[PDB]
Amino acid sequence: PELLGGPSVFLFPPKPKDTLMISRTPEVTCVVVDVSHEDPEVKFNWYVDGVEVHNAKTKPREEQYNSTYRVVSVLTVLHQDWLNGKEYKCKVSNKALPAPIEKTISKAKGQPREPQVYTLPPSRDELTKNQVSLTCLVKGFYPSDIAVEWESNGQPENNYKTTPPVLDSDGSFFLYSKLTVDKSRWQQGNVFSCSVMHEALHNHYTQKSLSLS
Amino acid sequence: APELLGGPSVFLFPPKPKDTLMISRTPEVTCVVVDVSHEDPEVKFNWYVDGVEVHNAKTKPREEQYNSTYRVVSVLTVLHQDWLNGKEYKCKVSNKALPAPIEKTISKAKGQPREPQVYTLPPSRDELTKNQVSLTCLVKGFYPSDIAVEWESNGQPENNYKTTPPVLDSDGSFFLYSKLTVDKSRWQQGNVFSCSVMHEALHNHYTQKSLSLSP
Amino acid sequence: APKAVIKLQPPWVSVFQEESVTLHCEVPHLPGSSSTQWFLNGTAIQTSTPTYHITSASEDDSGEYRCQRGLSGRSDPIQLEVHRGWLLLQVSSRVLTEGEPLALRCHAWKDKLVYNVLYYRNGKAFKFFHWNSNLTILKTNMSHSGTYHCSGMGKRRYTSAGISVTVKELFPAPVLTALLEGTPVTLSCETKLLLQRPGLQLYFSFYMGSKTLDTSSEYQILTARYWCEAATEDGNVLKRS
Ligand SMILES: *[C@@H]1O[C@H](CO[C@@H]2O[C@@H](C)[C@@H](O)[C@@H](O)[C@@H]2O)[C@@H](O[C@@H]2O[C@H](CO)[C@@H](O[C@@H]3O[C@H](CO[C@H]4O[C@H](CO)[C@@H](O)[C@H](O)[C@@H]4O[C@@H]4O[C@H](CO)[C@@H](O[C@@H]5O[C@H](CO)[C@H](O)[C@H](O)[C@H]5O)[C@H](O)[C@H]4NC(C)=O)[C@@H](O)[C@H](O[C@H]4O[C@H](CO)[C@@H](O)[C@H](O)[C@@H]4O[C@@H]4O[C@H](CO)[C@@H](O)[C@H](O)[C@H]4NC(C)=O)[C@@H]3O)[C@H](O)[C@H]2NC(C)=O)[C@H](O)[C@H]1NC(C)=O
Ligand SMILES: *[C@@H]1O[C@H](CO[C@@H]2O[C@@H](C)[C@@H](O)[C@@H](O)[C@@H]2O)[C@@H](O[C@@H]2O[C@H](CO)[C@@H](O[C@@H]3O[C@H](CO[C@H]4O[C@H](CO)[C@@H](O)[C@H](O)[C@@H]4O[C@@H]4O[C@H](CO)[C@@H](O)[C@H](O)[C@H]4NC(C)=O)[C@@H](O)[C@H](O[C@H]4O[C@H](CO)[C@@H](O)[C@H](O)[C@@H]4O[C@@H]4O[C@H](CO)[C@@H](O)[C@H](O)[C@H]4NC(C)=O)[C@@H]3O)[C@H](O)[C@H]2NC(C)=O)[C@H](O)[C@H]1NC(C)=O
């Protein structure tokens, strides 16, 4: 105890889509909260697998609504570095801290496993209603970092929801994605696609189509 | 040393969803008190069903956790219709490490109940190449999230399944998916599998949808 | 003879159960060996010494205290509340006038330690302290009125109950109440007292940009060839046109 008090530090991973497309910019984010007005200056040190890097971008402090300050530092990461399991450490220093605070984040460990993507048409019983549910089953993938989207004729589908990843018996994850479309469009044979982005997929994506027979 | 301010904490838990819908079962609310110090171990419970105190609650003995604290639990049986009508259940904990008795209250989730729609989805054409195969049960449009989903076949429980958490849908209701994994042998032999769902908005609180190969 | 006055030591009008507080009945003309009459909610108290010591406060000690000694008037009441809780927002007074300091304390039960304390006004935290610390607002204005409470971190995050504090306004802001050269001139300032202040009176001034022109409550040319500034003598309640 004794020296209790001072800011806290939270370290956030990059978005899964951002690590799987080389044109996007994946970033790890180090957020310091509970910074006082009296001791406002915060210092960040970033390490990648234990050696310091100097290209992080640190935003100026911003007054929160609870009278405290918040300071954010963003480190752009290389896609392959994150995918290859490198450890990103943020070290936060401030005179209200008697010893710096260090946080470490990396990709979940374990051999990556490729997801299987199965589209399932609406059940016959659901056809009697106004809207029908198209379902994308994605199973057998590891780690849980994944992205699921729907598309038809080059445009996104607005009305879909995806369950969180669920741990399955064999240690892999599965999820379902429900796209709600008007029964008229489904019966007019319009083709709907479910796109899955995951690191264990060739080119980090696969796409499965689904339409009425 | 001047110790950090603080004492025990209290958590009040609702009955399991299967216990609320079957009169065959007994639903119960559970009051758990953690961080109970050895130096002040005495815990007192007062239960109030909708304001009036009741006394049918039984408290488990003090059990020490390895973080050198005590964890005392008091369980109180509740009536089915009282829980589902909206009765407020209040636990009152008293301890000398507390400045005042801590009070927590639990009740069924408010909001107009909505009936769940249940649909069985057979395996995908492409999954038939595997020898372990997925049977899917979609349950959508239900409120509140309190639901129970199981699988049966030939009078026996099929337990090799997993069910997603409830998910908030665009229309304010909830949906989930249940995946039952069966060997492709059983699916092609023509066995009938059943998805059993229990929810307060169901008639008789129960509905089941069955699934087997079309031809 | 003047009125008696009660003083609290500590000055906090809210205390925890089993805490200690001493009440002092002070008559400005100091008296010798006269008895002190103490009252709780109009009911006299056995104690007759010029101070009253509550050793282990209980709910029976809550209410309005007044006192009186010799030929003094009975004091204005002091309200004491006794509470239970993890944290208590202690104030020196519930009612104040503009320019009178307000002292706040986030008091932890049994004087235990909390850190990362927040002070709240009207639900919004306006001050943060890594280590538990009192907080004093010296130049109070009516905007400091509200419900105050506090929070802090012990083994868990704990939060005090609210308590309302009023800072009464002393006088609104001024303007100046008012052509051919060679000119009759009548001009005044824009405010007078709001509380019944018997022995208080305001000082007014007349400024334009940097060129200024006192207790003079009326400004006037010889015959005519801007701002009225209203501030107490203490210079702690400033209002401008
Ligand atoms: C004063 O106020 C500040 C500010 O709060 C704001 O203002 C006040 C006034 C309020 O109005 C408040 O509601 C406002 O939000 C307070 O600061 C807060 O402090 C608390 C702690 O007291 C923090 O709580 C942690 O939150 C984590 C999650 O935070 C995210 O989600 C919340 C909402 O859920 C958001 O509000 C946050 O901002 C975070 O949001 C994320 O932000 C990331 C970075 O910006 C985003 O990632 C980046 O995204 C960008 C795009 O913009 C790029 O793409 C980048 O590439 C990408 O990296 C991200 O998208 C975004 N997410 C979302 C959903 O928006 C929790 O994870 C954390 O829990 C951990 O720690 C707890 C201990 O405190 C513990 O109990 C938990 O169990 C958990 O512990 C973890 O457990 C797991 C096991 O499951 C372990 O494996 C882990 O190791 C372990 N971790 C740790 C660290 O131990 C906390 O709950 C809160 O985040 C913070 N808010 C903000 C805004 O900073 C402050 O507290 C107030 N002071 C006082 C005295 O009250
Ligand atoms: C000392 O040890 C004890 C013992 O803990 C256990 O023992 C050892 C071996 C350790 O390894 C521990 O890790 C281990 O867990 C500690 O006691 C624990 O104390 C914490 C609080 O510090 C409690 O956390 C709360 O948990 C509830 C939910 O807890 C259920 O789920 C756990 C698994 O997920 C399970 O372990 C629990 O036992 C409990 O499980 C339920 O048990 C009952 C049996 O009676 C059964 O009927 C249920 O079916 C069963 N459920 C399941 C899923 O198994 C969680 O809800 C609490 O979070 C609330 O409060 C937080 C702030 O306190 C807040 O951050 C949250 O947001 C949340 O707030 C709620 O938010 C929701 C919205 O999401 C809102 O609707 C609510 O209104 C709101 N409520 C409140 C009150 O705010 C909280 O996280 C542990 O449960 C408890 N463990 C046990 C076993 O009692 C103790 O802390 C240790 N002390 C120290 C100093 O370390």
Residue numbers in the entry:
A (entry chain A): 232 to 444
B (entry chain B): 231 to 445
C (entry chain C): 19 to 196, 202 to 236, 240 to 251, 258 to 273
Give the text the authors published on this PDB structure:
Among the known FcγRs, FcγRI is the only receptor with high affinity to bind selective subclasses of IgG in monomeric form (1–4). All known Fcγ receptors recognize the lower hinge region of IgG with their receptor D2 domain. In the case of FcγRI, the lower hinge of IgG-Fc A chain, referred to as hinge A region, forms primarily hydrogen bond interactions with residues on strand C and C’ of FcγRI, while the lower hinge of IgG-Fc B chain, referred to as hinge B region, forms mainly hydrophobic interactions that include the “WPW” sandwich between Pro 329 of Fc and Trp 104, Trp 127 of the receptor. Unique to the high affinity FcγRI is the presence of three consecutive positively charged residues 173-175 in its FG-loop, which are not observed in the low affinity FcγRII and FcγRIII receptors.
Since Arg is the second abundant amino acid at the FG-loop position 174 and is observed in bovine and ovine FcγRI sequences, we generated a H174R mutant of human FcγRI. Indeed, the H174R variant of FcγRI bound to all IgG isotypes with similar affinity as the wildtype receptor. We subsequently crystallized the bovine FG-loop variant of FcγRI in complex with human IgG1-Fc in three different salt conditions at neutral pH. The current bovine FG-loop variant and Fc complex was crystallized in 20% PEG3350 with 0.2 M of different salts at pH 6.6-7.5. All three crystal forms belonged to the same crystallographic lattice with similar unit cell dimensions and their structures were determined by molecular replacement to high resolutions between 2.3 and 2.5Å, respectively. The three complex structures were nearly identical with root-mean-square (rms) deviations of 0.2-0.25 Å among them. The overall docking of FcγRI H174R variant receptor on Fc closely resembles those previously observed in which the D2 domain of FcγRI is wedged into the horseshoe opening of Fc to induce a conformational change in Fc from a symmetric to asymmetric dimer. All three structures crystallized at neutral pH with different salts contain well-defined electron densities at the interface between the receptor FG-loop and Fc. Arg 174 on the receptor FG-loop forms two contacts with the B-chain of Fc, including a salt bridge to Asp 265 and a hydrogen-bond to the hydroxyl group of the second N-acetylglucosamine (GlcNAc labeled as residue NAG502) on the glycan associated with Asn 297 on the Fc. As the N-linked glycan on Asn 297 is conserved in all isotypes of IgG and the second GlcNAc is conserved in all N-linked glycans, the result shows a conserved FcγRI-glycan interaction with all IgG isotypes.
